[PDB]
Each structure stands twice: as structure tokens, then as C-alpha cells.
Amino acid sequence: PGATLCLGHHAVPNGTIVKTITNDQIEVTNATELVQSSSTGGICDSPHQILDGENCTLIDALLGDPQCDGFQNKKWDLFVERSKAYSNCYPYDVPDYASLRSLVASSGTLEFNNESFNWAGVTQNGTSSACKRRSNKSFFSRLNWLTHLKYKYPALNVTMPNNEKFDKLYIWGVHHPVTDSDQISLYAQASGRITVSTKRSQQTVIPNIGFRPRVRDISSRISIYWTIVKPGDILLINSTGNLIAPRGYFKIRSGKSSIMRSDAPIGKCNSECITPNGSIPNDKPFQNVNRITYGACPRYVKQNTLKLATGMRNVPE
Amino acid sequence: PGATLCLGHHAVPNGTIVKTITNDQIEVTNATELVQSSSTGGICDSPHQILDGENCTLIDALLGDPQCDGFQNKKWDLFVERSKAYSNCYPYDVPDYASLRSLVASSGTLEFNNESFNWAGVTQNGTSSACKRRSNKSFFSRLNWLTHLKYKYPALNVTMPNNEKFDKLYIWGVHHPVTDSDQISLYAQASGRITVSTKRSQQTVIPNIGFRPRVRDISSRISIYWTIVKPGDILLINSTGNLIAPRGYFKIRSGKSSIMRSDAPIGKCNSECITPNGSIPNDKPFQNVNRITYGACPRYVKQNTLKLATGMRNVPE
Amino acid sequence: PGATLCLGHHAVPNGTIVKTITNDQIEVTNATELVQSSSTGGICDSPHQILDGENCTLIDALLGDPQCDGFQNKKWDLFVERSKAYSNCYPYDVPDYASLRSLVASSGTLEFNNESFNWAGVTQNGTSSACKRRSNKSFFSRLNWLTHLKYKYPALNVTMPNNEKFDKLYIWGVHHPVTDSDQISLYAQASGRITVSTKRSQQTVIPNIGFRPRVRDISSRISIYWTIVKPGDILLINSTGNLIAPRGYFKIRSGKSSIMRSDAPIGKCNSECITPNGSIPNDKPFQNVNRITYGACPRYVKQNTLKLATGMRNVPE
Ligand SMILES: *[C@@H]1O[C@H](CO)[C@@H](O[C@@H]2O[C@H](CO)[C@@H](O[C@@H]3O[C@H](CO[C@H]4O[C@H](CO)[C@@H](O)[C@H](O)[C@@H]4O)[C@@H](O)[C@H](O[C@H]4O[C@H](CO)[C@@H](O)[C@H](O)[C@@H]4O)[C@@H]3O)[C@H](O)[C@H]2NC(C)=O)[C@H](O)[C@H]1NC(C)=O
Ligand SMILES: *[C@@H]1O[C@H](CO)[C@@H](O[C@@H]2O[C@H](CO)[C@@H](O[C@@H]3O[C@H](CO[C@H]4O[C@H](CO)[C@@H](O)[C@H](O)[C@@H]4O)[C@@H](O)[C@H](O[C@H]4O[C@H](CO)[C@@H](O)[C@H](O)[C@@H]4O)[C@@H]3O)[C@H](O)[C@H]2NC(C)=O)[C@H](O)[C@H]1NC(C)=O
Ligand SMILES: *[C@@H]1O[C@H](CO)[C@@H](O[C@@H]2O[C@H](CO)[C@@H](O[C@@H]3O[C@H](CO[C@H]4O[C@H](CO)[C@@H](O)[C@H](O)[C@@H]4O)[C@@H](O)[C@H](O[C@H]4O[C@H](CO)[C@@H](O)[C@H](O)[C@@H]4O)[C@@H]3O)[C@H](O)[C@H]2NC(C)=O)[C@H](O)[C@H]1NC(C)=O
Ligand SMILES: *[C@@H]1O[C@H](CO)[C@@H](O[C@@H]2O[C@H](CO)[C@@H](O[C@@H]3O[C@H](CO)[C@@H](O)[C@H](O)[C@@H]3O)[C@H](O)[C@H]2NC(C)=O)[C@H](O)[C@H]1NC(C)=O
Ligand SMILES: *[C@@H]1O[C@H](CO)[C@@H](O[C@@H]2O[C@H](CO)[C@@H](O[C@@H]3O[C@H](CO)[C@@H](O)[C@H](O)[C@@H]3O)[C@H](O)[C@H]2NC(C)=O)[C@H](O)[C@H]1NC(C)=O
Ligand SMILES: *[C@@H]1O[C@H](CO)[C@@H](O[C@@H]2O[C@H](CO)[C@@H](O[C@@H]3O[C@H](CO)[C@@H](O)[C@H](O)[C@@H]3O)[C@H](O)[C@H]2NC(C)=O)[C@H](O)[C@H]1NC(C)=O
Ligand SMILES: *[C@@H]1O[C@H](CO)[C@@H](O[C@@H]2O[C@H](CO)[C@@H](O[C@@H]3O[C@H](CO)[C@@H](O)[C@H](O)[C@@H]3O)[C@H](O)[C@H]2NC(C)=O)[C@H](O)[C@H]1NC(C)=O
Ligand SMILES: *[C@@H]1O[C@H](CO)[C@@H](O[C@@H]2O[C@H](CO)[C@@H](O[C@@H]3O[C@H](CO)[C@@H](O)[C@H](O)[C@@H]3O)[C@H](O)[C@H]2NC(C)=O)[C@H](O)[C@H]1NC(C)=O
Ligand SMILES: *[C@@H]1O[C@H](CO)[C@@H](O[C@@H]2O[C@H](CO)[C@@H](O[C@@H]3O[C@H](CO)[C@@H](O)[C@H](O)[C@@H]3O)[C@H](O)[C@H]2NC(C)=O)[C@H](O)[C@H]1NC(C)=O
Ligand SMILES: *[C@@H]1O[C@H](CO)[C@@H](O[C@@H]2O[C@H](CO)[C@@H](O)[C@H](O)[C@H]2NC(C)=O)[C@H](O)[C@H]1NC(C)=O
Ligand SMILES: *[C@@H]1O[C@H](CO)[C@@H](O[C@@H]2O[C@H](CO)[C@@H](O)[C@H](O)[C@H]2NC(C)=O)[C@H](O)[C@H]1NC(C)=O
Ligand SMILES: *[C@@H]1O[C@H](CO)[C@@H](O[C@@H]2O[C@H](CO)[C@@H](O)[C@H](O)[C@H]2NC(C)=O)[C@H](O)[C@H]1NC(C)=O
Ligand SMILES: *[C@@H]1O[C@H](CO)[C@@H](O)[C@H](O)[C@H]1NC(C)=O
Ligand SMILES: *[C@@H]1O[C@H](CO)[C@@H](O)[C@H](O)[C@H]1NC(C)=O
Ligand SMILES: *[C@@H]1O[C@H](CO)[C@@H](O)[C@H](O)[C@H]1NC(C)=O
Ligand SMILES: *[C@@H]1O[C@H](CO)[C@@H](O)[C@H](O)[C@H]1NC(C)=O
Ligand SMILES: *[C@@H]1O[C@H](CO)[C@@H](O)[C@H](O)[C@H]1NC(C)=O
Ligand SMILES: *[C@@H]1O[C@H](CO)[C@@H](O)[C@H](O)[C@H]1NC(C)=O
């Protein structure tokens, strides 16, 4: 009689369909998903330092809009900007806004140091009803609106050396009055011109008098500029009117900081990978949640699912 | 005696040489080409909506050059710009020309709506011998050259609200006269200044009087600018001279539209993939016709040919 | 008794560890390194034409700084800029500096042709103590500082046609005086304005009078601009003061030329691939020396080492 000895392999009743080089649909005993397609819906507050902008854009927190005083000197790994954020100060624009936003986001700090600028012969600390704190007329916290003193505005020619070991970021502005009579009532002369320079750079800006549409009841504008001053260099401000003066400088650092637009709530939890949709697990190599990511994240791909076989071909009985 | 039974495989007299991981030249029984290397030489007019610019650049058709009146309100999937195209109106430049061209190309429409701007106290509809229609002096169809009325040009301070559900694109310009006497004869005052603003943006432009080389016998210039006005925002134009005024707005859409430089003829045929060389079949995954493509196109690669084996190794008798 | 016949394969005592799809560490009999991780430390002077900038930036050699007279009309495949390089002429800036540097680097030539500009009614060849040659006051070699003649500066309205078969690059500038009295003592009128145009382009620049920090004892500045003039086009310079005039044009070529920042010494040797660290062998497909490369170079990758098996699995006795 003898015996029979059969060689074989396992199978399962419930196999999984995968793709190969030669077949778009072949059943294997087991597979694992390589694309992360879901988020928790919230941004975990750990392990990255998250700063929720709430009502404030980064630039409003920089300039010191009345709703953003809580942000002074704060640092972040990720600044989260909300779609509802709105400005509540004097109407302004920033030529190159995207660049200033980027460079501050990347620096990751609003650390500010006051400096004693000698604004000889002018009135300091100008305020406006378009920028209230506690119903008092106010202004951007980090800027100094200079105006005439006893109907004179003598030329400014003011220096601030950088004797630090680090770079300084200066934010400053030019005021564009609505009319020629406004120009005279504020600055006591028919126009201005502002030149801000260092040993290696120069910027001159001309105020442009005229009407813009009313925003928070103001038809004038402020235009915001910035200047970086290296160790051993010197800031020189030379102006005859219309200067929205710096009060000091911001520290500028380098590191891993960034900014993200999201309306996702911040939660008490721990996740390395942040998207605008919320944090996502990062076990998988790929994800199709969002191209926008921050941290140790799977790579964004177009596919919904990619199944990696983890077993043999399934050949059921 | 018994029998002999031989196992074997086919071969062909005429095999094809392919590349593998271990051999740059191995003969197989059959192969297929994966790189499309030829075009028909013409651009098929289907299934994309093709607009042949003929003598007109997109920007000339936008502004309304005399040779481009046939283009009014036309739409396209692909605007085809010809190398022979030339301007036949007042000499102009567009700071950022590439961006205006891109944004209009991408929008895919020249749909224009006239609006009633109140140009109180000036002469409208200025014309020039450098921009003829039917030998009559004329001007860009979408722009309004304003000049003095009875040797006065009172300040303009004109508003146009956007109460639509869509964005409006405004095209406007500044006239740079050749001389101080030209400035006075056109605008009745020594210079101009133009500020165009919205609630969220502002542009001011200064005319610059002086000689440029003659183009179509004109040594002055026009510089072209644009402004996008969102729903609920308001256009404000404030100027004292030198304004080349808008007559209305263009619709701005988003979609699949673009622009291509080509001298290929347009034919009555159907092809999904367009290159400057002409339409190409899109059965193959790769092509080496042109990096510039539009539609469902193979991907551009450097290789002339890539042969995919579709049979076994060929081992002839 | 009979015989025994055993089939087998070789092995070595000293195998090499490689990575595969299924194992990060498997021993093979032999392998070869695919990542170049070392340089010689010097830049080989062959086979590319190397131009060592020594104390000169490319832009200083272009303008004709006193330390850069040896560079006149030189050509390069690779211009090497040293970190110690410094300027020793009148303090200047170049709006778009990076672009002018790039376009000259890419052109690969400082070939300069003088032209006879008719500067009727002004003093030519102005010099300064901030730009010495042999202790004599001097100026940038390729620029012409125009000033008043007998306390007059009549308007300039000067033409230079391009009747060549090639494009011309013109470099020119605007002088920004420190004070209103300086403006008058140099140019005999209260301000300037410079318009440089062609048939297809226009640039106007306004001088901006004021103090900048002293650099080589000068608080004024020069701002440098450029203009390309095509065959058949015409350069037109129209100015009333503050013009730092061109003396001629540079040739502009296209080809394989570039620029690199490096402090590596130049040696007498032959290597196709240049990095800032020095030349590297290019036998391997990859390298981790520097992302910055010039010539026939391996591709930059993050890995230190990638070992390609060149033998079987090593199974020692
Ligand atoms: C089909 O094939 C897949 C892939 O091989 C198998 O999935 C693995 O299953 C094993 C055994 O259950 C898993 O091992 C466990 O992993 C946990 C950590 O999870 C990591 O990866 C997952 C991915 O989903 C993430 O959730 C997470 O962030 C981690 O990165 C460990 O915590 C587990 O530990 C447990 O056992 C150990 C034994 O020492 C103890 O220390 C602990 O007490 C603990 O209880 C465990 O190691 C493995 O993660 C799975 N891999 C993947 C990729 O999912 C399936 O099991 C297989 N299915 C079938 C039916 O055969
Ligand atoms: C060497 O190997 C290649 C690849 O396997 C073989 O090429 C295939 O040959 C078959 C049979 O001739 C082709 O099948 C036919 O395809 C036509 C559609 O063409 C598509 O792909 C080509 C690519 O060149 C494009 O021109 C075109 O845009 C399409 O995307 C069909 O129209 C044909 O239909 C005919 O038969 C069917 C049968 O039902 C009928 O419905 C119709 O009446 C009609 O007459 C047909 O299906 C196939 O396209 C080829 N593939 C490729 C990639 O070229 C070679 O045959 C082989 N050579 C040898 C000697 O063995
Ligand atoms: C482990 O596996 C590797 C890869 O197979 C083997 O390395 C090869 O070894 C052979 C024989 O020594 C080498 O052949 C020689 O190449 C020289 C040119 O070098 C090129 O590549 C190297 C890469 O390091 C560069 O240095 C160089 O820039 C070149 O691009 C030739 O000059 C040699 O010529 C000599 O022999 C010929 C015979 O005709 C004569 O003409 C000359 O007189 C001359 O003396 C020779 O051809 C080959 O380059 C190596 N390849 C690589 C990638 O390194 C190892 O040998 C093997 N190790 C073991 C223990 O088996
Ligand atoms: C130049 O044109 C602009 C735009 O048309 C004019 O601005 C408008 O000025 C009026 C009058 O001051 C403003 O009216 C005010 O509206 C507020 C808000 O409702 C109200 O509280 C005030 O009592 C007053 O009615 C109007 O808001 C403003 N419009 C815009 C769009 O800014 C400007 O007056 C013109 N200048 C001249 C000199 O004519
Ligand atoms: C750059 O800073 C300097 C230094 O303050 C400014 O120059 C100074 O400007 C003032 C006011 O414009 C000048 O005073 C005026 O002089 C005229 C001439 O007699 C007189 O009529 C006026 O009543 C007034 O006194 C002053 O002379 C001048 N100083 C120098 C050294 O030139 C300059 O304005 C600043 N630039 C900018 C853009 O702000
Ligand atoms: C400032 O310089 C420019 C450039 O040299 C001068 O422009 C030139 O002006 C002359 C005289 O009007 C133009 O001549 C005309 O040429 C046309 C075409 O052949 C002809 O039909 C007319 O009868 C006349 O001869 C010339 O085209 C023009 N050149 C350029 C390059 O634009 C300008 O006159 C100078 N301004 C002053 C105030 O000197
Ligand atoms: C922005 O729009 C406003 C409103 O039209 C413009 O302001 C107005 O400009 C005119 C002409 O410059 C001023 O009239 C002039 O007043 C002087 C002073 O007495 C007089 O000598 C002249 O004969 C003439 O009548 C008008 O007062 C002024 N209105 C206001 C409210 O300031 C302004 O020019 C526009 N800006 C631009 C850049 O166009
Ligand atoms: C406007 O402000 C600037 C910046 O504070 C003033 O520039 C400074 O001017 C002084 C006086 O000319 C310069 O002093 C000189 O220093 C050199 C080098 O040590 C020395 O050789 C001279 O004998 C003299 O002491 C100083 O360098 C310069 N500072 C800077 C940073 O540029 C300018 O004077 C002010 N203008 C007015 C009208 O007040
Ligand atoms: C562009 O080039 C033209 C041609 O040279 C310049 O125009 C000319 O400018 C001069 C000086 O500004 C004018 O002469 C002046 O005329 C007035 C008016 O009577 C007189 O008071 C002065 O004493 C002087 O003679 C000349 O008339 C004028 N020519 C023309 C045809 O307008 C213009 O300045 C140049 N533009 C630039 C930005 O440099
Ligand atoms: C995460 O957020 C993104 C961005 O909003 C979502 O992608 C959008 O999905 C909508 C449909 O819900 C589409 O209309 C848009 O085209 C998508 N936007 C972009 C920018 O691609 C995405 O669905 C979200 N994913 C998850 C898993 O929540
Ligand atoms: C399609 O058009 C392109 C662009 O003109 C052709 O590519 C050029 O070919 C010429 C030689 O005829 C070269 O001198 C240029 O360097 C190429 N230009 C570019 C931008 O790469 C191409 O040959 C055409 N292809 C076909 C199949 O017609
Ligand atoms: C070649 O030069 C590069 C650039 O300086 C070197 O890369 C730097 O290495 C230092 C450490 O020595 C790091 O701190 C920097 O982050 C690196 N710089 C950049 C820009 O990546 C590199 O080490 C040199 N390689 C060799 C083989 O000499
Ligand atoms: C943000 O603004 C809204 C009103 O727009 C207000 O209800 C809310 O209290 C503000 N949040 C903070 C944190 O100030
Ligand atoms: C301006 O305000 C600050 C407080 O913000 C104060 O320290 C300073 O004395 C004020 N200066 C003047 C001139 O009013
Ligand atoms: C285009 O211009 C040429 C002359 O340059 C003319 O022959 C042709 O008729 C024009 N085409 C159209 C469509 O107007
Ligand atoms: C300007 O021209 C248009 C026709 O293009 C006409 O409707 C309008 O009445 C003209 N306006 C004036 C003020 O001449
Ligand atoms: C470069 O400058 C240094 C001083 O800064 C000098 O020692 C050296 O001789 C200069 N080199 C050349 C080539 O002129
Ligand atoms: C300017 O200098 C050059 C030499 O660099 C000389 O040829 C020319 O004659 C000088 N011109 C004047 C007007 O001084």
C-alpha cells in the first residue's frame, strides 16, 4: 500500500485584491494599506509648539493690532492662521506681503526689543479712532506715528547701530494722507519722502496723497516696509514727513518654524504630522489627505489606496 | 523503438532589439514603441476650442488693437499666438506683461462689459493717427483716452462698485507724453498722478515725460496696468491727468484654458494632445516631440525611442 | 564504489554587506561604491576655462572697480567668486543684483566695445577719492560720471543705434547725492530724472537725495541699471542730471558659462566635474559632496554610500 505525502500552502476564505506588474487584480492572503486617507479632524498640540492665531493674522500680530496684544514675544513651531481673522486697526498694505509673512513665519518668533530713537522736534505716539483699545484711540503697538510739533516737522536724520551678535528686523511704514490739507495738518509741509538705509541697502518711499475707499471709516492708507540690519551695520532713517516709525526691532532666527492656514480645532493630543485637515498618523509612507503638511509626514500622492501584499497568492479550496 | 516528444517555443525570422537590465541589445520576437516621435504638423480644431490669434497677440486682442475687433467676447480652451503677430496702435508696454498674458490666457475669455464711468469735466474718446481704423484716427477699443475740456482738467475721483457675484478685471493705463508742452496741450497742467485703489489694494503711477524712439511715428508711450475687484469691493480712480481710462471690465473665470506659441496650421480633425509642432497621437506613454503640451498628452522625455518587449527572446533556427 | 561529483560556487573570506529589497544587510562576494563622497580639495583648471575672481566679484569686474582692470574682455566657462572679495570704488547697489550677476555669468564674457556718445555741453570723466587708482582719484572704468560744464547741464537726449548682428548689454547708473547743495554743485539744477528707452522697453529712475551710512567715507550712492538693445533697435538716453553714463556695451553670448562661490584653490590638473569643495571624479552615478555642481557630474544624493553588488551571495566555509 505505502503512503502519500502532499506538499502545500495555506489559504484564507477572505483574501485581499492587490495590483502587480502583470495584473491589476490578484487575490493575496493579506495586505497592508500604504496611503493614509483619514485625519482625526483636529491639530494635536504636541509635540510641536502650536500658536493659534485666533482673530489675528501673523502680520497683525507683528504690527501689534489691538486684538493681538496677547501675542507679544511669543514663539512657535507652527503658527495657525484662521480664515475668520480680520484687522481692526488703520487700513494698511504690505508690498510683498507674502514675503514678510513667510520670513516671519520661518523665523518663528515675535521677540521684540524696544530702542531709543531720537525723534527730535516732532510729536510722537499718534493715535486714531480706526484703531481702538478699550474705546481709547490707539495705534499699532510696534509703530510710532510721528506728526508736527507746534506746526513744524524738522527733517529727521536718525541712526541706530546694530552692536549685537544677531540680525535685526525693522518694520516701518509710510502714511498716505487722503488730501493736501490732511498732509499739511499732520506734517506741516506739502509732501514727504522717506529714505531708510544701511551700509548695504537703501529703500526710498514717496507718500501718495489721495482717496482710497473707506475701510473702518478711513480713506488714507499706511504702506508697510521692512529692513534687515546685520551685526556691525547701522540703520539710517532720513525723512521729512509721513514716517510711521519703528519702535525697535524683531529678533530673526532660523529653524524649523512655519505657518499654516487651517480652521481645524487644536486638541490635547500628540501627533508628529500636521495638515490643515488635522493631524494624521505617520506610520504609512504615503497620504492623500493634503499636499500641505508640517512635521514628519507621509508623502502626498493622488491615489486613495495602495495595498501592499503581505502574503502569498490566495487559492481557496 | 518508442517515441520522442520535444517541448519548444516559437521564433521569428525578423526579431526586434530591446534593452534590459543586463543587456543593452537583446532580440525579442516582438516589441512596441513607447515614445511618440512624430506629429501630423497641424493643430486639430477638435475637441478643444482653439482660437487662432492670426495677427493679434492675446494682449492686443484684450486692449482692442484695430486688427483684433473680431476677437471681442471670444472664449478659448487654447489661444494660439503666431510669431508674425504685430501691434498696429499706440506704442505701449505692460510692466509684468508675462503675468497679464498668463492670467488672461488661463481665464479663457475676453468677455467684456461696458460700464458708465462719470468722467465729469473732461474730453473723452481721444484718438491717434498711430491707431487707425479704416484710415480714421482711432484708439484701443477697450480704453478711453481722456483729455482737457476747454483747457481745464478737473481732478477725477470716480467710483465703480462691484455688486456682481464674480470678480472683475479692469485694464487701464497711463500716458507718458514726449514733452512738457505736449503734457500741457493734452491735460492743461504740468504733470499727472494716477491712484487706482480698492478696499484691499492700491496702485499709483507717475507719468514720465520724455522722448522714446519713434514707433509708428510716436515717441510717447502708454503703460498698461490692471486691477482685480472682488464682489462687494469698489474700484476708485483718482487722477489729475494722463489717465487712459477703462471702459468697463473683463470677466475672469477659472478652468482649463491656456495659450501656446505656434505657427502650425489649424486643421479640421480630432486630437486630444496639442504641441507647437502640431497635434500628436496619445496612445503612447511618452513623447519626444515637444516639452510644450496641452491636453491629454504623453509625457515628454529625452529619448527618441523606447521599445517595450511584447514577446519572448527570439532564438532563430 | 563509483564516484561523487559535487556542484558548487566560490566564496571569499572577506565579503561586503549590501542592501536588497528584502534585507538591509546581506553579504556578497564583492561590491562597488556608487556615491562619490570625496573631493581633491582643489578646482582643476582643465578642461573648463576657469576664471578666478580673486578680490573681484563678477559685478565689480563688469563695472570696472580699480582692483579688476586685469579682467577686461576676459571670457570663462566658470567664474569663481571668492568669499574675501570686496569693493573698492564708489558705494553702489544694483536693484535685481542677482539677475544681473546671473545673466553676465551665463553669457561668459566681459567683452566690451567703446562707443562715441555725444554728451554735448557737460563735463565728462568725473572721479572720486573713494575710487582710487595709484592714489589718483578715479571711477568705474566702464562708466562715465557726467557733471555740469560752467554751471550748466543742458538736457541730454542721446541716441545709439544697434546696427550689429548681435545684442548689446548696456550698464548705466543714477547718482543719489547726499544733499540738495551737492545736487546743485554737481548738476546745476534741483533734481534729475533719467529715462532710458528702446523701441520695446523703457526705464525711468528718479534720484533720491539724502544721507546713507558712510561707506569708504561716502554717504551718497549710485544705483546700477541695465538695458539690452536688440539688432535694429536704438538706445535713447534722456536725462537732466544724475546720469552715470555708459561708455559702450558688453557683448552678450549664450552657452555653457556659469559662476560658482568657492574658496577652493585652483590647481593644474584635469577634471570634468567641479564643486565648491573642489573637483570630483565622475565615474560614479551619484555623489554627496555638494548640491552645487558644474560640468559632467554625478547626481547629488543624501546617502553617504550606496554599494552595488558585483558578485553572488557570500557563503563562507
Ligand atoms: C497582515 O499583515 C500585516 C503586516 O504584516 C499584519 O499587521 C501587523 O500585525 C502585527 C501583529 O498584530 C503588528 O504588531 C503590533 O504592532 C504594534 C505597533 O503598531 C505600529 O504600526 C501600526 C500600523 O497600523 C501603528 O498603529 C502604530 O503607530 C505602530 O507604528 C505594537 O504595539 C504591537 O505590540 C504588541 O505585541 C508586542 C509583542 O512583543 C508587545 O510588546 C505589546 O504588548 C503589544 O501588545 C505589535 O507589535 C504590526 O504592527 C502590524 N503591521 C502593520 C503594518 O499593520 C497583520 O497582522 C496581518 N494579518 C493577518 C490576518 O495575518
Ligand atoms: C506585436 O505586439 C503588439 C502589442 O501586443 C501587437 O500590437 C497590437 O495588435 C493588436 C491586433 O492588431 C491591436 O488591436 C487593434 O487595436 C485597434 C485600436 O488601436 C489602439 O492602439 C493603437 C496603438 O498603435 C492606436 O493606433 C489607436 O489609437 C488605439 O488606441 C483596434 O481598432 C483593433 O480593432 C480591430 O479588431 C477588433 C476585434 O474585436 C474589431 O473590434 C475591429 O473590427 C477592428 O478591426 C484591434 O483591437 C493592438 O492595438 C496592438 N497594440 C499596440 C500597442 O500596438 C502586434 O500585433 C504584435 N505583432 C505581431 C507580429 O505579433
Ligand atoms: C569587484 O568588482 C568590481 C566591479 O566589477 C571590480 O572593479 C573593476 O576591476 C577592473 C579590473 O581591475 C577594472 O578595470 C580597470 O579599469 C581601469 C579604468 O578605470 C575606470 O573606472 C574606475 C572606477 O574606479 C576609475 O578609476 C577610472 O576613472 C575609469 O573610469 C583601466 O585603466 C584598467 O585597464 C588596465 O587593464 C587593461 C586591460 O586591457 C589595460 O588596457 C591597461 O594596461 C590597464 O592596466 C582596467 O580595465 C574596473 O575599472 C573596475 N570597475 C570598477 C567599477 O571599479 C573589482 O576588480 C572586483 N574585485 C574583486 C576582488 O573581484
Ligand atoms: C472721492 O470719492 C470717494 C468715493 O466715492 C468719496 O468717498 C466717500 O465719501 C463720503 C463722504 O464723506 C463717504 O460717506 C460717509 O459714509 C459713512 C459710512 O456710511 C457715513 O458714516 C458718513 O456719514 C458718510 O455718509 C463715503 O463713505 C465715501 N465712499 C467711499 C467708497 O469711500 C470721497 O468723498 C470723494 N472725494 C471728494 C473730495 O469728493
Ligand atoms: C536728509 O537729512 C537731512 C539733514 O537733516 C535733510 O536736509 C536738511 O533739510 C532741511 C529741511 O528741508 C534743510 O533746512 C532748510 O533749509 C532751507 C534752505 O535755506 C530753508 O529755506 C528752510 O527753511 C530750512 O531751514 C537743511 O538745510 C537740510 N540740511 C542739509 C545738510 O542739507 C534732508 O531733508 C533729509 N532728507 C529727507 C529725504 O528727509
Ligand atoms: C531726442 O532724440 C530723439 C532720437 O534721436 C529725436 O527723435 C527723432 O526726431 C526726428 C525729428 O522729428 C525724427 O525724424 C522724423 O523721422 C520720420 C521717419 O523717417 C520722418 O517721417 C519725419 O519727417 C522726421 O524726419 C526721428 O524719427 C526721431 N528719431 C527717433 C529714433 O525717434 C528727437 O527729435 C530728439 N528731441 C529733441 C528735442 O531734439
Ligand atoms: C484725489 O481726488 C481729489 C478730489 O477731487 C483731488 O483733490 C482736489 O484737487 C483739486 C485740484 O488739484 C483741488 O482744487 C484746487 O484747489 C487749489 C487750492 O486753493 C486751487 O488753487 C486750485 O485752483 C484748485 O481749485 C481741490 O481742492 C482738491 N480737493 C480736495 C478735497 O482736496 C486730488 O487732486 C485727487 N488726487 C489725484 C492724485 O488725482
Ligand atoms: C545724518 O546722519 C548721519 C548718520 O549719523 C550723519 O553721518 C555722520 O556724519 C559725521 C560727520 O560728517 C561723520 O563723521 C566722520 O567720520 C569719519 C570716520 O571716522 C571721520 O574721518 C570724519 O572726520 C568724521 O568724524 C560720520 O562718519 C557719519 N556717520 C555715518 C554713520 O555715516 C550725518 O552727518 C547726518 N547729517 C546731518 C546733516 O546732520
Ligand atoms: C528729454 O529731452 C528733451 C530735449 O532736450 C528735454 O526737453 C528740454 O528740456 C530743456 C531743459 O529742461 C528745455 O529748455 C528750457 O525751457 C524752459 C521754458 O522756456 C526755459 O525756462 C529753460 O531756461 C530752458 O531753456 C527745453 O525746452 C526742452 N525741450 C523740449 C523740446 O521740450 C527734456 O528735459 C528731456 N527729459 C528728461 C527727463 O531729461
Ligand atoms: C482635506 O482638506 C482638503 C482641502 O480643502 C480637501 O480637499 C478638497 O476637497 C474638496 C471636496 O471636499 C474639493 O472640492 C477640493 O478640490 C479639494 N481641495 C484641494 C485644495 O485639493 C480634502 O478633501 C480633505 N481631506 C480629508 C481626508 O479630510
Ligand atoms: C518640434 O518643435 C521643436 C521646437 O522648435 C523642435 O525642437 C528644436 O529642434 C531644432 C532642430 O530642428 C533644435 O535646433 C532646437 O534646439 C529644438 N528646440 C527646442 C526648444 O528644443 C523639434 O525638432 C520639433 N519636433 C518634431 C518631431 O517636429
Ligand atoms: C563640501 O562643502 C559643503 C558646503 O560647505 C559641506 O557641507 C556642509 O557641511 C557642514 C559641516 O562641515 C554643515 O554644517 C553644513 O550644513 C553643510 N552645508 C551645506 C550647504 O549643506 C560638505 O561637508 C563638504 N563636503 C566634502 C566632502 O568636503
Ligand atoms: C474674535 O472675534 C470675535 C468677534 O469677531 C469675538 O467674538 C471673539 O471673542 C474674539 N476672540 C478673541 C480670542 O479675542
Ligand atoms: C510715547 O509712548 C510711550 C508709551 O507707549 C512713552 O513711554 C513715551 O514717553 C511717549 N513719548 C512721547 C514723546 O509722548
Ligand atoms: C494679417 O496681416 C497681413 C499683413 O501683415 C495681411 O496680409 C492679412 O490680411 C492679415 N490677416 C488678417 C486675418 O487680418
Ligand atoms: C464716446 O464714444 C462712445 C462710442 O464709442 C459714445 O457712446 C459716447 O457718447 C462718446 N462720449 C463722448 C463724451 O464723446
Ligand atoms: C587682494 O587684496 C589683498 C588685500 O585685501 C591683497 O593682499 C592682494 O594683493 C590682492 N590680490 C590681488 C590679486 O590684487
Ligand atoms: C574722457 O576720458 C577718456 C579716457 O578715458 C578720453 O579719451 C576722453 O578724451 C575724455 N573726455 C573728456 C571730455 O574729458
Author numbering:
A (entry chain A), B (entry chain A), C (entry chain A): 9 to 325
What does the primary publication say about this deposited structure?
Since entering the human population in 1968, H3N2 influenza A virus has evolved extensively, especially in its hemagglutinin (HA), due to selection pressure from the human immune system. The HA glycoprotein on the viral surface is responsible for cell entry and is the main focus of the humoral immune response. The HA RBS is a shallow pocket on the apex of the HA1 globular head, and is formed from four structural elements: the 130-loop, 150-loop, 190-helix, and 220-loop, named after their location on the HA primary sequence. The HA RBS engages host receptor sialylated glycans and consequently is relatively conserved in sequence compared to the rest of HA1.
We further examined the structural basis for the loss of E190D reversibility in recent H3 strains by determining HA structures of HK68 E190D, Wy03, Wy03 D190E, and Mich14. In the panel of the eight strains tested, Bris07 was the earliest strain that lost the E190D reversibility and Wy03 was the latest strain that retained the E190D reversibility. We then compared these structures with HK68 by aligning the receptor-binding subdomain (HA1 residues 117–265). A slight shift was observed for the 190-helix of the RBS in those H3 strains isolated after year 2003 (Fin04, HK05, Vic11, and Mich14), but not Wy03. This finding coincides with the aforementioned notion that the reversibility of E190D was lost during early to mid-2000s. The Cα190-OH98 distances in HK68 WT (Glu190), HK68 E190D, Wy03 WT (Asp190), and Wy03 D190E are around 9.0–9.7 Å, whereas this distance in Fin04, HK05, Vic11, and Mich14 is around 8.5–8.8 Å. The Cα186–Cα228 distance in HK68 and Wy03 is around 4.5 to 4.9 Å, whereas in Fin04, HK05, Vic11, and Mich14, it is around 4.2 to 4.5 Å. HK68 has a Ser at residue 186 and Wy03 has a Val, whereas Fin04, HK05, Vic11, and Mich14 have a Gly. The presence of a side chain at residue 186 may increase the Cα186–Cα228 distance, as well as the Cα190–OH98 distance, and reposition the 190-helix further from the 220-loop. This notion is consistent with the fact that G186V can restore E190D reversibility.
